[PDB]
Design a protein around this ligand. Sequence first.
Ligand SMILES: [Mg+2]
Ligand SMILES: [Zn+2]
Ligand SMILES: [Zn+2]
Ligand SMILES: [Zn+2]
Lengths: 141, 43, 159, 49, 65, 196, 559, 263, 85, 168, 133, 114
Amino acid sequence: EGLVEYIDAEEEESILIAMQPEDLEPAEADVDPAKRIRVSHHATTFTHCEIHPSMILGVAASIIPFPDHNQSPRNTYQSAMGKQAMGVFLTNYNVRMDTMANILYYPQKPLGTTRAMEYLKFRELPAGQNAIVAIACYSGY
Amino acid sequence: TLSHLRRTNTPIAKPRQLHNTHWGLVCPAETPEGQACGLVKNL
Amino acid sequence: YDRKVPSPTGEYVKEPEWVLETDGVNLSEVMTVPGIDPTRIYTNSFIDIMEVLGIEAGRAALYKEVYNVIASDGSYVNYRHMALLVDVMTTQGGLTSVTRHGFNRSNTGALMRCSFEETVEILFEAGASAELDDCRGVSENVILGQMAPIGTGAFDVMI
Amino acid sequence: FDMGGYFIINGSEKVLIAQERSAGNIVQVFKKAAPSPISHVAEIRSALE
Amino acid sequence: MIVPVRCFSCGKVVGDKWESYLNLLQEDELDEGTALSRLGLKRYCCRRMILTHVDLIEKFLRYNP
Amino acid sequence: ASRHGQKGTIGITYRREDMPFTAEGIVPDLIINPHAIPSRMTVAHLIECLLSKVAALSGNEGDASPFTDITVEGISKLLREHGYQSRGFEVMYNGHTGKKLMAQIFFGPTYYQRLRHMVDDKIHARARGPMQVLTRQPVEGRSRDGGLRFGEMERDCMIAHGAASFLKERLMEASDAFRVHICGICGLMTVIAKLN
Amino acid sequence: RGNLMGKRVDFSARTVISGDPNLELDQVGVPKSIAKTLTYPEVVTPYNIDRLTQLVRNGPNEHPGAKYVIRDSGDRIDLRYSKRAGDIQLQYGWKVERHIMDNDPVLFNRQPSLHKMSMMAHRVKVIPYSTFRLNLSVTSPYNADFDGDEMNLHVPQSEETRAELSQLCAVPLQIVSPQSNKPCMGIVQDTLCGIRKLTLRDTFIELDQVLNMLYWVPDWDGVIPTPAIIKPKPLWSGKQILSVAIPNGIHLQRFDEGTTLLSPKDNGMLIIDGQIIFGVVEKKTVGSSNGGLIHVVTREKGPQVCAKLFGNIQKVVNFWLLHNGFSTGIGDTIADGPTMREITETIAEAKKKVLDVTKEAQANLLTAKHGMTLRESFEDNVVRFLNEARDKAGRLAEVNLKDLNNVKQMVMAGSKGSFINIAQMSACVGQQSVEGKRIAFGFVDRTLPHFSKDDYSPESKGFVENSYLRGLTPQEFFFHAMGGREGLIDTAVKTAETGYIQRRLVKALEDIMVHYDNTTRNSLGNVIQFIYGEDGMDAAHIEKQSLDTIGGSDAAFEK
Amino acid sequence: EEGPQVKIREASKDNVDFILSNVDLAMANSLRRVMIAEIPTLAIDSVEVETNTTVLADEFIAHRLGLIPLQSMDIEQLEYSRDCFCEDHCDKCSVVLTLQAFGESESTTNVYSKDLVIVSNLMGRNIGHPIIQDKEGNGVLICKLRKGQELKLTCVAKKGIAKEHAKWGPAAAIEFEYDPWNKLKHTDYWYEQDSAKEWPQSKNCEYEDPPNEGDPFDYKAQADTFYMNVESVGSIPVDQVVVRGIDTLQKKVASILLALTQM
Amino acid sequence: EKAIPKDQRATTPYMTKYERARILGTRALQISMNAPVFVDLEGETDPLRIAMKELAEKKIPLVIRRYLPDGSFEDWSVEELIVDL
Amino acid sequence: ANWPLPVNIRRIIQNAQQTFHIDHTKPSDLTIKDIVLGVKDLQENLLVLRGKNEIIQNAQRDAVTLFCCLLRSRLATRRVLQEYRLTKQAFDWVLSNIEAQFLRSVVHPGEMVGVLAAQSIGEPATQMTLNTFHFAGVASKKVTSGVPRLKEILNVAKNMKTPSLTVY
Amino acid sequence: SNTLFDDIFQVSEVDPGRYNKVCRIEAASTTQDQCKLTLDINVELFPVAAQDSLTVTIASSLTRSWRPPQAGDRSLADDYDYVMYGTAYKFEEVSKDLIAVYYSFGGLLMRLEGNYRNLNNLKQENAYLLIRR
Amino acid sequence: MNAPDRFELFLLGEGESKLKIDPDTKAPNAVVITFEKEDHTLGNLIRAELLNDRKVLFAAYKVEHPFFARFKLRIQTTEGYDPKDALKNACNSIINKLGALKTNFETEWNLQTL
RNA sequence: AGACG
DNA sequence: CGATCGTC
Ligand SMILES: [Mg+2]
Ligand SMILES: [Zn+2]
Ligand SMILES: [Zn+2]
Ligand SMILES: [Zn+2]
């Protein structure tokens, strides 16, 4: 029906993209100090709109909670580590004869999730636990 | 696994850098540290 | 540029002065320009200082440059260390590089040099020119599996 | 939950990593270094599909 | 993977509560928080135990032998 | 590791009693350092916890999705509604004494990951073992009972120290060392070893 | 390189390292399993015969035991296999390969070893569990942390070799570094953070706790010091109890800013006969600083004493803080509604300054100063405005942070965090950069496809107005990501390049040694220096000192 | 009655809410610690697996078996096997449980703690009966079976304390608060605008009078009056968690006193 | 030939750390090999601790050959060398 | 004024002050001769090189030029009496303390001084965060620094990236 | 021995500069129209408001390990409210006939300007401060 | 794999005695007791009671390393008071306080419903 | 080759 | 003709 379209970096060059549908193209004529600062409109001659800016990220980064509130190299570091984490890699693990297999006894779905994790099947095959954690100076160990 | 199946390799002016054109195409975060930083990409 | 200058009353006083910075080098020519202070003219090109002012002037500039690299990072290394590095490049009469072109070509031991770079070819011209290895070097004794003349091995112990 | 996209070569799961190359048949102009007599160059890496 | 017997943090027996929790949601129409509290899971460490549980055993029994 | 580029190893294990505790009787499964935060600037880690504390309490899933309108204030309003000081802080009592800590601890759940490469998979120790055929030098690897590398870089530190004999020992007695026969005239390995 | 300069060795061990608040500075925590693997050849003398037979009887699997027994003819008796394993009737001159025992000297190393301090002798302490444990104050020379790091342990096989470690390589001897003529070890993390907190004028401790803290200091004279307060409570100050760890004969004077002998701000530092008179103890006092308690103590009392000092300070502080506690929440990043208003409007006026300068440039009114492009000057201006913006906003945040602010506290102690940290986390992340310039037009005439062509606005070229607390926008996100990546690339390049430099530097000066005529010569005996460092002085025994004749007025010199 | 005093607010088969007035904090704590760690109970400490055609690993199962609470009412009339003069185990030192389950039905079969059978001779004492608090009467789900699935195993339940393994925890969570007004100034509140407004009031505030603003700080004042809530896992009743708690601690203090006479 | 006589000896009268450590090393090695002790013992059993006493009580019968850069040397007894440090 | 030099004279003075229990209320027992000649003798007694010939004699004098400048400035008659308030007993102790500490401060023959220097520069070079200088905010401040510069130096690079001249 | 100084002061300022237990006191002698005092006080156990009239005393007695008060039969020179033990650190001369004394009470600083008590306040690790009313 | 057994926390191993009484080197009528296979439950409890004794000049305890389940108790008493007697009295004082509490709880417990 | 600081 | 360190 042509409601959506496939664009490559070459065609990307000729188009004007809105980030949010509403938040980027309704009307004009007080605010929340807590909410981040987004610019304005200025550019209005739009041809396309982003399906969702979180879609700029890949599998590893789509697992991070609030990466938009983190220093860029830490988001890169986490990406490397998540691939060193344990949990159910597959349901048929009990049925495969493979060199090295690490499976978590009681894997838990994270309390803090990303809308992208629904597709990444993370809550269905998790790689961690929701540990009760204190940020504290205890024995110094 | 999902990540591995979405990996890129670049053999051989500034390929290690996150070019503007990568927007929405390749992941801005996920790249190996040191060795092949920015040469190994993820969709 | 800011300058620490002694006032007529004795104390050092911040007296700011006009200074010119340059893209490019021609030390010889610029220093003869009237109105400049030829006593004060500087170049980050230590090799140009070496050519125009001499080896000892070169050594001074060479330290000054090494010093500035460390100083810029915030870090401080005792004078003696960089002093020694600089003096080493300097003692040959000219500027000897810290590469296989500068120190690895020097009149040192055949085995002590084949430890760094050009391993095989250093050993070939050693056999070709029929070199005698002193074995008074650290690297030689390391190869020979002997207590080298380093700290503890620097002296001999007898009854 | 398996996604596929890999091969099984002598019982081993094989991923073919995407290989980044510069696209062919593109015209691109480049300036040149100070010693070089050729100041600019136009290049085309022609290939047949 | 079966509800753990006992909460890791405090040890309050949580093993006897899954069958019950699942029923409270599916049959009783109730929402998790009320369902959790109805099972007497007052402290948040016990709550995470059941709320965050992924019951992979159900999937594992679907394999034939 | 936490889901925020926060890798760290177990330093010690404490049982329930010795651990600091909440007036509710809650205790941590993990104690992370306050110092792991400033330099790292991993604010999302703190935010995750706030959200996760509220999520566990309310029996809902916390939305930690990026480009959204979820605010630390919005989370705080919900957590306080649940009867906890809005910024995750909780009064903790010392496990050894029962005495309240002068400081209040940022407490709550946070998704942590168990990572591969554990102490036991890394521990190696070799006080003599297998020698490689060509070099007559210790083997390479834990699986082979290999010798740890005392590189030229290591050799340099011992020179700086002026420890001549240790350096002689490391390169001979430990590792290599071999008795060879040489001619006084030609100075070559020509002398036939015809012992006894 | 791989067989002569360096090689694989016997009597070595490797594992994950962990920190130990209860280990002496010079000690190393060795897993009983490793202790049982590594041995020391010990000759049977009448001085040890009794202990050696006993250790032989304990065998290779029970701890203080031995692995092999060597006699004349040079034949090893394998204690784990031999039928006469529990029959060995020892003879003098025979060697007993005993397990590594407590207080043995062992060479401890962390890779890369680009330092004499990256390789130090430690006293063994055989402990349970699989990690190597080390005192936190030995962390920095090694450049170690506990995120998964591994270390190398070497055992000397000779008496002279074990003398060389204890007399040259030993950790206490290594305290005052010749590299920067200051100590290379100081009080860090919890201990550095807690020591500030313990030191405050407000900090008052009482008997129950005082006595515990006193007893915790091993060296303690058993003398209860008289409390600073004798009024409706015997109340000891934090400074009092901490001075118990400082030995007698210790004098230290400083003066920071407003420091005037009656120190109103409780700043600077004054210690007399080892009693802290005034000033909060932080990094300047207790870090690896130039005129530090450590530099002073090593010099005055000695290495062995100063090594104990780290332990004593650690023990009290760790203890007091275990009972005081310290944390950091999200609340520590939250700056006031009014502070946020000022931050918001600060960045707004920066945005105008840029906009106006842009309008000026576009009007052709902008005149570039000699030596640079009209555009080169413009960019220099915009970048200046925008950095100033982040700096003012960050300073506005810092000011609003209370002394109860856990981040502010960590900065004040000098344990963790700097200005930028406070600033970027709570006020404004600020401008992003690639190759020194602000975000380039990767796309034709635009940074991103959500922007119009020829947009030089801060927002367009990588200015992150938002703080990590507020969150970054997709544009800000990508731009910060472009900057981050650049960091990683040259982090990876720096590691590679500096390493090569280091080898060359080392190869070039290997053979330069101070000879018996104070001369600095090489392997050919060529003179590099006539007096080492032009004074024939050792760097470790040197300190920054004020030359009282050089400065001051001619009148004040005379007076 | 002398010294320490108790005042029960709430009481049930599972929880005790009470005020421990006229006691030292050192004592309040030593007790809180001992309730957690040192009261002996009976837990499975050995599993022999005959058949395991289940989805789960033997040790995974075995681990949960130790976690099943068992009756520890008359635990003192059961010896620690380390003290027993038998070869390995017996009836004087252990309780033997049986678990045999087969997936007869097409539908998924559940294995409960009700499915454990005491095979050992109990010699008349409330010991080893798996704790069942589930309304339906099958406390704890050991595991699940499909069809050909079978789980035949044998359990040796032994006496022990949480200090050795958390499975021997009679306790669970112990609520513990003193001075709910911070009149003692034992903590320094972290605030932004108002500590009072930012920090919620505890239920325990009703049981104490507020500090009254214009009053000088009580320097000499000490901690007595501790609001506690002992929760039982069921292995031992609530009164008994506290009573054996006091008793265990009393015994270890008597042990020291006794060892002074031995020297 | 070569040598230097006792009169006219420019080298440091104080024992170097390296001289000390090698002295203590050589001595401890001798003590460890059932060689006679030139000092009394305070219940002492460690060869290094014993060598330290023998040095502290200047009863180590050893000499240090201090080679100069030409090849010439200055012989100094452990007994004559000052052990400050 | 502040320069790394052996012997912390300030610390010695404080040590004399505490040890001998100096009271700034009693007049000292010292002489102009005791101070003036005392500081002067101490100068002849600071050894680095021991040889008696003129070459080595001058070498030795040159090696202690700066430290004696320090020594004089600190141990001046007006300062020893008005500032420090030393006694003959305490002053003599200071003089023998400096002497001993100085001789202690001297480098030991055998010190692998070259490797030391190499690592002393190498280690901090490794720690160098960024090749990008903090002058990257102003256009007329670009000068090749950090690891690249250090490379240009050690290689004696003929063609350097930022050849610059500074005219006074 | 005995007392070394005794006087009644009048408090001008009371400043809690970044503290909640400590206050630096600014006071001048009621009798001595030149004498001054600067002192850090624990306002928690002993509060001081503006214009208060306090009796300041410096003594030297009522060495060895500290024994708890033990009111069993003990009696100290206490007919005061606030008592502090401290060390002498500097004796400064504020021109000709004006001297200043410096006492640290475990970090609680104290200064006393005047001249009267010359041979009284000497260099001592000893010194007890006593305040009343 | 280097982990000591959990019984080693509360079980004395052949050669280990419960209490070890060593006389203090630094002070008169002062002593140090090594409590083997014990923690903060006994340490803090006894140290706090010893303080309640007027004749006790000093009482502090420490656990030198979390790995090992032992502690040290330093006691200094007035002349004419053996620190052993102080420790004994403290223990008895504890038991009496405990006994009282046991009864009181039982009395209150038997008054309760549900 | 692949993974780690 | 060079090109960080350890390890599977
Ligand atoms: Mg690391
Ligand atoms: Zn729980
Ligand atoms: Zn021959
Ligand atoms: Zn039995």
